[PDB]
């Protein structure tokens, strides 16, 4: 039980603070689990609009989304679920997500359609590099570390060369081009 509470607090905190990027729908699902755990089964007369301080149940980016309704719906579908069970379900859900355990970096993509830069989520794992929608948290494009020919890290950007995979590179604006590059180099070094 105690081990379960450590895993829970970690997964919850990583979601609430943004460390673990998730969609709006998923954020409300967790909230539901969080509510059950903190308040017990949903109660119409005790748990009514305004009861929840959205700041403690959703990631910053989702507070002003008026999703309290979605949360109470998630809380309601928990039925008479015990705290332990809800905790268990919280973690499993977090671990089942494509974004779980992925080191992310907030970068900016310069494309056509305009001259403005589109913020984007860049994730690095021990076996791949992924482009994630800054908002939807959906995976736009994913690359295999083995497809990387070379990379360039400047104090203002980072570039990836896949050589024989696709035409052109993939550059983004970031002040962590160094951090990202080192991360990749290390992972690649262990594969061989």
């Amino acid at each position: 039980p105690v081990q379960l509470n450590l895993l829970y607090v970690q997964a919850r905190d990583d979601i609430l603070n943004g460390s673990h990027p998730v969609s709006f729908d998923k954020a409300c699902e967790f909230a539901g689990f969080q509510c059950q755990i903190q308040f017990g089964p949903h109660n119409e007369q005790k748990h009514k609009a305004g009861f929840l301080d959205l700041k403690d149940f959703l990631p910053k980016e989702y507070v002003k989304q008026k999703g309290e309704r979605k949360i109470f719906q998630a809380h309601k579908n928990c039925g008479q679920m015990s705290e332990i069970e809800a905790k268990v379900r919280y973690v499993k859900l977090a671990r089942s997500l494509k974004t779980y355990g992925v080191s992310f970096f907030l970068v900016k993509e310069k494309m056509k359609g305009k001259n403005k830069l589109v913020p984007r989520l860049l994730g690095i794992t021990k076996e791949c590099v992924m482009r994630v929608d800054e908002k939807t948290k959906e995976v736009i494009q994913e690359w295999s570390l083995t497809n990387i020919k070379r990379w360039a890290a400047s104090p203002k950007s980072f570039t990836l060369d896949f050589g024989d995979y696709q035409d052109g590179y993939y550059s983004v604006q970031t002040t962590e081009g160094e951090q990202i590059a080192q991360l990749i180099a290390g992972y690649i070094d262990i594969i061989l």
Binding site: P1, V2, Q3, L6
Partner: peptide, 11 residues
């Protein structure tokens, strides 16, 4: 002194 491993904490 002693430092406990989380792996042995109650479930």
């Amino acid at each position: 002194s002693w430092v406990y491993s989380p792996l042995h904490y109650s479930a």
